[PDB]
């Protein structure tokens, strides 16, 4: 019997790919999520993990019997190296456009962020993405019968996006939410409380928390699987239900608590 | 043990009131539905059954421990005597406004329909309703934390409306649908196929069927409880699940089949 993934798994530690629900499949690593949403008309790939993960994701797609060339759209959570790292690699393999909200586009073209990213100084360099389609903040990415809805989720980054869609097993259909990271973490310089340095940025983060908390949410998945206890819900160590309609509310509420702790930490330092 | 209601129950045969789900309660008769949606800020009454049913509905509200004076809005399915019959009676008892779409208002003010009703010649006279609030075709009726969304459902009548809302038992929340009648029945004169006599009417009926079929639908209830097999899902004779996410689709599909049978019948007669 396979032993499954640890919550503190390395970002590049391999995971055997497995169904999440219906036509949503997990193709990421033990430490970093990537999802494949499939149809007979082609697929949507969600996230790219770390600049090193291209090959594992591609191997995992094929392990499930899907062809990377049948992926017709790529979307992602946010423009940090640990989720956008293999986008260019995956675009070449699939031929698919990458969809990005406006505040992520320059980062994807450079392969590095700018000072608008809270984690600017700790960024690792990425391959640029060549074919980017600008995604409206409430846009829908459609491939055949598939439709993934964007929920703009700035805060952890300027360009972050949560994604939502329906997956079915026969007539039993579930609202899937791939909620973006909501951690208020930074490099050693950035201060969430310095509004003059980034006007409206923290307010937008608070608004993201409220929007995520309010989503219709049957099955939650997060870019770091442990942030939603994914390995306690699927795979060999699963001991809790996959479906929990309170999950997005609890996720956002915890994130709000942690955001306010970060603000307290900033108040305590000059 | 109580024996429960028959599917061919008389419209005025009494039913003991019982929870449907959460804060949605059944307060109608064995043959004709009425629902009460409750909150600590007041309630919404859905439908009025037959001109004779005022007292049973009011008794049933009180049997559950709710006060008619705490009802703050009344809505209804459609403007036939067997669903709108006791509206004026219930308005007096509750003091609540009745919400109606534009094509039902004159019928509610007269207490009889006009020739726009397929069943005009078989109408029974109703008490007029004095305080009517005009409801937009996609309007929301709000009372405290309650919010009922209108889905205009012309076809069986010009003014018919389906209603949808969420009811919860703790954290387990359900999308309730009180779908209007979809039966293509008439008096001896009306022809659904005579578009010149009522331009666009049948197209609107077909559009209603499509809209109802597409609703998010956890628990379906219908003005005639048997039309959705309600007594096979709640009460003493229940043998099938209350929740069925296919119910609105199946309801509308059956109705489409019956509508097309009606068109065949009309083609066969001059
Ligand atoms: Ca995360
Ligand atoms: Ca009915
Ligand atoms: Mg692998
Ligand atoms: Mg790579
Ligand atoms: Mg930038
Ligand atoms: Mg959580
Ligand atoms: Mg009774
Ligand atoms: Mg009466
Ligand atoms: Mg009229
Ligand atoms: Mg049915
Ligand atoms: Zn990040
Ligand atoms: Zn990350
Ligand atoms: Zn649902
Ligand atoms: Zn009727
Ligand atoms: Zn009726």
Describe the 3D structure.
The structure is a homodimer of 270-residue chains. By secondary structure, chain A is an alpha/beta fold. Chain A has one domain (1-270): Metallo-beta-lactamase, Chain A, CATH 3.60.15. In chain A, 24% of the residues lie in helices and 21% in strands. The first copy, chain A, contains six helices and twelve strands. In chain A, strands 1-2-3-4-5 form a five-stranded mixed beta sheet, with helices on one face. A five-stranded mixed beta sheet of chain A has the order 8-9-10-11-12. The N and C termini of chain A lie far apart (53 Å). The interface between A and B is small, with 5 and 5 residues. Residues 78, 80, 156, 181 of chain A line the site of one zinc ion. Chains A, B: Zn(2+) 2 binds at residues 82-83, 224. Chains A, B: Residues 31-224 form the Metallo-beta-lactamase domain. Chains A, B: Zn(2+) 1 binds at residues 78, 80, 156.
The CATH H-level superfamily of chain A is: Ribonuclease Z/Hydroxyacylglutathione hydrolase-like
Sheet of most strands of chain A: 5 strands, mixed
Q: What is bound: which ligands? A: calcium ion, magnesium ion, zinc ion
H/E element sequence of chain A: EEEEHEHHEHEEEEEHEH
User: Termini separation of chain A (Å)?
Assistant: 53 Å
Which chains share the greatest interface?
A-B, 5 and 5 residues
Radius of gyration of chain A: 18 Å
What class would the helix/strand composition of chain A place it in? alpha/beta
Number of strands of chain A: 12
**What is the global morphology of chain A?**
globular
Q: In which order are the strands of the major sheet of chain A placed?
A: 1-2-3-4-5
The CATH architecture of chain A would be 4-Layer Sandwich
CATH class label of chain A: Alpha Beta
Q: How much helicity do the residues of chain A have?
A: 10-25%
* % residues in beta strands of chain A: 15-25%
DSSP helical segment count of chain A = 6
* Number of structural units classed as domains of chain A: 1
> How would you classify the quaternary structure?
homodimer
Domain Metallo-beta-lactamase (chains A, B): 31-224
GO molecular function (chains A, B): metal ion binding
Binding site for Mg(2+) 1 (chains A, B): 51, 89
Disulfide bonds (chains A, B): 5-30, 168-173, 217-248
